[PDB]
Design a binder for these strands. Structure first.
Lengths: 83, 153, 100, 127, 207, 100
RNA sequence: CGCGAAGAACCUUACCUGGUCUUGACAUCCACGGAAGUUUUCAGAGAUGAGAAUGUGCCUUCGGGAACCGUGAGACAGGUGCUGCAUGGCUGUCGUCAGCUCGUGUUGUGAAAUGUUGGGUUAAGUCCCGCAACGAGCGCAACCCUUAUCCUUUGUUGCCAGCGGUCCGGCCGGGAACUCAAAGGAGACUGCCAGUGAUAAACUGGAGGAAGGUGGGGAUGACGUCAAGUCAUCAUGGCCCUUACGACCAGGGCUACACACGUGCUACAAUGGCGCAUACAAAGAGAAGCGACCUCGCGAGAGCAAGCGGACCUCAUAAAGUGCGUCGUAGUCCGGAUUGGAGUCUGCAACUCGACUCCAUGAAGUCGGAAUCGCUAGUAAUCGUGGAUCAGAAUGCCACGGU
RNA sequence: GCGGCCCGCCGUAA
């Protein structure tokens, strides 16, 4: 984890649209490629689709998941079992 | 080997007794290349045995050694198909080496606390002609005399 | 005047001996008191590379480069010494440094 | 006047000065038994004396550097033996037989390519 | 792969280096790269002459180049115009100013590089390899030498496995360090791939 | 390797040394112990804006002769194969075979 | 099978998904406009598109190169694409084993033989004697590096016996003795003695000497065998793609997991664990880098900042050992895997997928079936230290000393 | 002087 003397990492080009979709309606889920961004309280209640390498899958953000990364969801590897 | 090795390594005598047998004994008991602990163990065990015996520091040692000392043993020398384990005669240095190795190996297979106590106990038992150490001598002699038919070679 | 230090380094010993002999001789000619060519322990660095283009990690070679050092330390430069050094300074593959 | 000797071992060197006094085993400005941990080192350092002129008319100002315990003890013994040679020239006729004159030249080997140590090679369990 | 390189093993005994200069860690790689560039350019440019060996020495703020050859007139030209073109280009390649020199090869039948690339040039004109090998060995023995060995490898016309041949007479001891052995290689591109050439020349044992 | 790899390498070097100046103070104010909130925030949001192929960490040094990404040596700048053949030939001054 | 790889978060990167280009990301050509620029706004995941000022400067010999961009066409470039059974170069292996051949002359109708076989020796086709053979070549040995003993030369940043004071620190004055430093020489050759031996060649002991019988350790690998390995370091003969098998960008993968093998690390304890105090190495590295002293921190670290291109400074406290106290054979104040919480640091960026610190938790494990391998002396076993690759990152690799 | 221990696909350097 970061040093706490630098703060979380945002990847601004996501922030510039999360700031405009928070107030001017626009409840359409967003399209993004930044799996390395944190979850701020500003995003609460919104839906965002995150690329997993093959196609983006949408998630609905909640309150307890604030502080994690965008990629903590949307798993990449696909496995079912040896059968 | 196929060739012949000539010579023999020389070892310093014991610092506080001047006995090469003590040096060889502590060398055999030495593990990991840590001589100081081995000689500390040997000295503690010897003083305990001397107290429990009433003799000098060497008389008990020689008595215990002479209690467990091979005279003959078998050796698989073979002619014409089968093996025919036969008994042979043992030269003195081999006898001393075997005796000390058996003493130590019996020493390590006991549950008494600390090696020095164990070693003293087994030396005292050998002085009294009992214990696991004497059993090896006895059964080696037994096996050797069982095959006392092919010894013509 | 003061200490004047000359440090000499080269990858070969014959020409370093030649150069130190030449410099001590010219310094003695110009007129001053000089001291011995200190041997100044050498540096050796090794390398180890494997030779096969593809496999066989156990095939390797060892290479090294030696660097020799010599110290002169000419003391009390009387006169014409500095110009003589700045004019008589010729060597191929020899590095030379001078300090005040 | 005093006399000199030099002993060497695995990686140790010894400077020995001998003077006709009665008992002086200073080593690096320290006494013998305090410098050397209680072990056979004291036996080996006093060994080349008890057979000739058993530490009566002698002073043993000693300096040592490099190596470990046993190396330093052996180097000291070699230096002391060598120093006595320039005291009486007839002492060779016994020190030679004692074996203290010869300089031991055993030291560690290289680590060679493809081996874990000087001679230990990786386990060979190939079929 | 069994034989140690004959030239390298003797670099400190009876053989000199080809580049002689001193440097520290900062400029070692740059000096090596510059020497590689200049040697490559000279080899490309002076192919038509008989160039044998390039020695590069760095004076303090300078570079000094000497060329060994057997036909110096071609390299040096009618006047010093061509050596001047070479000097301009070389001083362009390496920043410091440059000076050029020419060496003279007295017996071209020695100096194995010349023999090797002569044989390659002959092979490029579709001549039987065996005649070339015998011719070279006979010439070298006639001019005076204690031994010589040549060898050729590759697809010598037949589609079958590439073959190998070699001839030798005299003495060519390779396990004695005192011996002065000259060794060099070359290769020729033909219509059926490349052919390798190696030459050993034993000028004489040195005390 | 291929030509495009070397082209990418040289472009990376150029972009790295073009913007070297400003990244220093950007990181300096990011790491400052007396920096306020808004300035540090703007710095962390602005250093991100630079072209990605500009950090020095985005460069793999490779052999000058060929461009091999493995087996590099900082001392000479060549891969193991080329340094071995050149050392045998006699290009490197001072190199020998170590025995000891 | 800890192999290419001396080091995988992006890059590396070849592979997958999607978004893009067509004389091209890298060269030579042809014709116009054009210092090369530098700052900066927007759309974008980004490639990339739009833009706005900044700029138009040399020799001018008057049009070119310098200067690079931006265009349009055509030769062309570009392929880690297939064939190691078309090849060069470079390695492994039998094997550091002692063998492998030729010229001339003789013998046989001929393939071939002789020499190279025989007696005695040696590490050795190493040597003597004999013999239709007489001589050579590549091999063996020697010439090379290092280690062990002395002698000269030089004496700082290295050394301190004698001298003087000295805070008692080689600290200073001094010294050139000793250690050491790196240059040059001496030394071992069965040299000498006795015995055995075909009055050879050699082999047993002895003296002397630091070293005695190729002193110890390396580097050096004959003719050839295995259609051995590598077209993906590199170079190449053939084919085969050219709006694509060429080129650019963002995310993902090379790290998956019912399982099976190879190579290692730590243990199962009392020759031990824990606490306190103390003592002896060698070899290396250092400028976009080694980083001291002080001050904050329990800690990983942070702030300020000297010195060092280095026998001067930093890395950098060696650990086993040795003295005291405790634990008392107990799945244990043995063992430390897994998991929770809280942090530091490198880097645009530690989710997949880094290394360390603190607190808590504390698993299997009580010496291992059939089987199997390494080592002959400073060697096995054991204990620590350094270096390369490298922003970051070793239980691997390559080196150094102690017992 | 005498214990036991079997097999190895088709073509293929010049």
């Amino acid at each position: 984890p970061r040093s706490l003397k630098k703060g979380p990492f945002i990847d601004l080009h996501l922030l510039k649209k999360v700031e405009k979709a928070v107030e001017s309606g626009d409840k359409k889920p967003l399209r993004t490629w930044s799996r390395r961004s944190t979850i701020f309280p500003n995003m609460i209640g919104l839906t965002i689709a995150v690329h997993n390498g093959r196609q983006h899958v949408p998630v609905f953000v909640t309150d307890e998941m604030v502080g994690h990364k965008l990629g903590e969801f949307a798993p990449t590897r696909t496995y079912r079992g040896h059968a | 080997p196929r060739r012949r090795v000539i010579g023999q390594r020389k070892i310093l005598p014991d610092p506080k007794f001047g006995s090469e047998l003590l040096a060889k004994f502590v060398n055999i008991l030495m593990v990991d290349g840590k001589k100081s602990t081995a000689e500390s163990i040997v000295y503690s065990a010897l003083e305990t045995l001397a107290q429990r015996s009433g003799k000098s520091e060497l008389e008990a040692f020689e008595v215990a050694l002479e209690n467990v000392r091979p005279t003959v043993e078998v050796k698989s020398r073979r002619v014409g198909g089968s093996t025919y384990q036969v008994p042979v005669e043992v030269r003195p240095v081999r006898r001393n080496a075997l005796a000390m190795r058996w003493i130590v190996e019996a020493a390590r297979k006991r549950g008494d606390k600390s090696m020095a106590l164990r070693l003293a106990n087994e030396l005292s038992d050998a002085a009294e002609n009992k214990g696991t150490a004497v059993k090896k001598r006895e059964d080696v002699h037994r096996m050797a005399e069982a095959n006392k038919a092919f010894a013509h070679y | 005047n003061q200490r004047i230090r000359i440090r000499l380094k080269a990858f070969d010993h014959r020409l370093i001996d030649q150069a130190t002999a030449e410099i001590v001789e010219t310094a003695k000619r110009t007129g001053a008191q000089v001291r011995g060519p200190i041997p100044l322990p050498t540096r050796k660095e090794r390398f180890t590379v494997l030779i096969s283009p593809h496999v066989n990690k156990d095939a390797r070679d060892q290479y090294e480069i030696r660097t020799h050092l010599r110290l002169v330390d000419i003391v009390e430069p009387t006169e014409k010494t500095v110009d003589a050094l700045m004019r008589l300074d010729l060597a191929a593959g020899v590095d030379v440094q001078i300090s005040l | 006047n005093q006399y000199y000797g030099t002993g060497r071992r695995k990686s140790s060197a010894a400077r020995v000065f001998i003077k006709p006094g009665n008992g002086k085993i200073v080593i690096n400005q320290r006494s013998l038994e305090q410098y050397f941990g209680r072990e056979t080192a004291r036996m080996v350092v006093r060994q080349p004396l008890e057979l000739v002129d058993m530490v009566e008319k002698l002073d043993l100002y000693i300096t040592v550097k490099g190596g470990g315990i046993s190396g330093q003890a052996g180097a000291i013994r070699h230096g002391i033996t060598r120093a006595l040679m320039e005291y009486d020239e007839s002492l060779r006729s016994e020190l030679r037989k004692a074996g203290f004159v010869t300089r031991d030249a055993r030291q560690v080997e290289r680590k060679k390519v493809g081996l874990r140590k000087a001679r230990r090679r990786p386990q060979f369990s190939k079929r | 792969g069994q034989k140690v390189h004959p030239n390298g093993i003797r670099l400190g005994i009876v053989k000199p280096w080809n580049s002689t200069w001193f440097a520290n860690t900062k400029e070692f790689a740059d000096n090596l790269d510059s020497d590689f560039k200049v040697r490559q350019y000279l080899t490309k440019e002076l192919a038509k002459a008989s160039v044998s060996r390039i020695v590069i020495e760095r004076p303090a703020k300078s570079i000094r180049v000497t060329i060994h050859t057997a036909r110096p007139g071609i390299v040096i030209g009618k006047k010093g115009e061509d050596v001047e073109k070479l000097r301009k280009v070389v001083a362009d390649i390496a920043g410091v100013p440059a000076q050029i020199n020419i060496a003279e090869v007295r017996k071209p039948e020695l100096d194995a590089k010349l023999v090797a690339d002569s044989i390659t040039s002959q092979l490029e004109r579709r001549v039987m390899f065996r005649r070339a090998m015998k011719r070279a060995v006979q010439n070298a023995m006639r001019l005076g030498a204690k031994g010589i060995k040549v060898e050729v490898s590759g697809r010598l016309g037949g589609a079958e496995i590439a073959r190998t041949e070699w001839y030798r007479e005299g003495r060519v001891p390779l396990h004695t360090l005192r011996a002065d052995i000259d060794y060099n290689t070359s290769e020729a591109h033909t219509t059926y791939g490349v052919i390798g050439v190696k030459v050993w020349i034993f000028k004489g044992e040195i005390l | 390797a291929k030509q495009s790899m070397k082209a990418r390498e040289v472009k990376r070097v150029a972009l790295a040394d073009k913007y070297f100046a400003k990244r220093a103070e950007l990181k300096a104010i990011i790491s400052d112990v007396n920096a306020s909130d808004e300035d540090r925030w703007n710095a962390v949001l602005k250093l991100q804006t630079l072209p990605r192929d500009s950090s020095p960490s985005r460069q793999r040094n490779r052999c000058r002769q060929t461009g091999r990404p493995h087996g590099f040596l900082r001392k000479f700048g060549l891969s193991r194969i080329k340094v071995r053949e050149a050392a045998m030939r006699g290009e490197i001054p001072g190199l020998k075979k170590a025995s000891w």
